[PDB]
Amino acid sequence: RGSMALKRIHKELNDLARDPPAQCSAGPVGDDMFHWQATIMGPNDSPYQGGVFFLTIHFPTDYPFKPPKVAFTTRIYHPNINSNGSICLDILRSQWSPALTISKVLLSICSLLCDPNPDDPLVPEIARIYKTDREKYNRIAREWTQKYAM
């Protein structure tokens, strides 16, 4: 909160609107600027193609000096995202910089969907299938996009 965070959050939203991310949405849920929602459409040639994924974003009271809290509300079959929707991404913690923006964060997540990090698994078994039988990985990933993201 405080003046500085609110001003930076709103500055981020204006830049995001003036340069609409490719089929990815993000903005405040209602009138509290520290509470955002993002919608991500599955990449075109990924097993997530066709699905729509919703996330919750919570800016810390000291933003940009603290990272935002991001999580999936939509179920997804992925090695770096568990059942609580928790996202295992470095920039969301240790590789966090005040020079980063939510726009960069969304992009970083989009990439995560396209290229998982099986070496840093949040879900062991999904990491395994991915590494040892990627065709199956894609079939199951495609299946969950049907049951949960459409």
UniProtKB/Swiss-Prot annotation:
The keyword ATP-binding applies. Its EC number is 2.3.2.23, 2.3.2.24. One of its GO terms (biological process) is protein ubiquitination. Pfam families: UQ_con. Changing residue 147 to E: Abolishes histone H3 ubiquitination. The keyword Ribosomal protein does not apply. Changing residue 67 to A: Abolishes histone H3 ubiquitination and decreases interaction with PHF7. Pathway: Protein modification; protein ubiquitination. The active site is at residue 88. InterPro entries: UBQ-conjugat_E2_core, UBQ-conjugating_AS, UBQ-conjugating_enzyme/RWD. Keywords: ATP-binding, Nucleotide-binding, Transferase, Ubl conjugation pathway. It is an enzyme of class 2 (transferase). Signal peptide: none annotated. Residues 4-150 form the UBC core domain. Accepts ubiquitin from the E1 complex and catalyzes its covalent attachment to other proteins. Catalyzes 'Lys-48'-linked polyubiquitination. Mediates the selective degradation of short-lived and abnormal proteins. Functions in the E6/E6-AP-induced ubiquitination of p53/TP53. Mediates ubiquitination of PEX5 and SQSTM1 and autoubiquitination of STUB1 and TRAF6. Interacts with SCF (SKP1-CUL1-F-box protein) E3 ubiquitin ligase complex. Interacts with CNOT4 (via RING domain). Interacts with E3 ubiquitin-protein ligases CBLC, PJA1 and PJA2. Interacts with PDZRN3. Interacts with PPP1R11. Interacts with E3 ubiquitin-protein ligase PHF7; the interaction inhibits cleavage of PHF7 and promotes association of the complex with the nucleosome core particle. This is Ubiquitin-conjugating enzyme E2 D2. The gene is UBE2D2.
